Nucleic acid binder design. Structure first.
Lengths: 89, 100
DNA sequence: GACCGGAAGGAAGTG
DNA sequence: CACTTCCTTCCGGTC
């Protein structure tokens, strides 16, 4: 698996709710527990040595590669970008 | 701290410092709890700068690092006491010997 | 001004 | 490459 897919995969499970959620309707999501999620991006990826600090650094390589964007000024909230997302898929 | 790399991270560096009383003037232990105090934060910061060849380094910045260690359970703030922090060896353990 | 933790991104390391 | 690692840098907020 690769990170952008993993997150979608989790979002899909919107029986989760508490730990992650769609904000807007144009690809906008917000971990309402970036800890809970950072664990899961490790449990699955094989790394309990993994945290929000490392998690978000990779979503920043997702900026240059146009795979994802940051929602300017709402906390833990990010924008999915279909442009680069498909170009990988 | 010798175990650290016999066979460079700030927390190793702090241990490196805290292992030699000659450094007492800028940092020292407070108990056998793992608590330590920066007697001279600026002089510590300076020395972390010198090491990473980053000459603009300071306590503002260094302490942001230390703050990221809270999440990795590699240390904690001594609440109230100034420039005072506490190693926790449980997090160092998971760093040297990841046990899933 | 200490202490906090978001948010950015360099830069060498990993599989 | 696809992050991972560990910061360094800047920051507004709260005490």
């Amino acid at each position: 698996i690769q990170l952008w897919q993993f997150l979608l995969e989790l979002l899909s499970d919107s029986a989760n709710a508490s730990c992650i959620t769609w904000e807007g309707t144009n690809g906008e999501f917000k971990m309402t527990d970036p800890d809970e999620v950072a664990r899961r991006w490790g449990e699955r990826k094989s790394k309990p040595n993994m945290n929000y600090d490392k998690l978000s650094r990779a979503l920043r390589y997702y900026y240059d590669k146009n795979i994802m964007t940051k929602v300017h000024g709402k906390r833990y909230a990010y924008k999915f970008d279909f442009h680069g997302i498909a170009q990988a898929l």
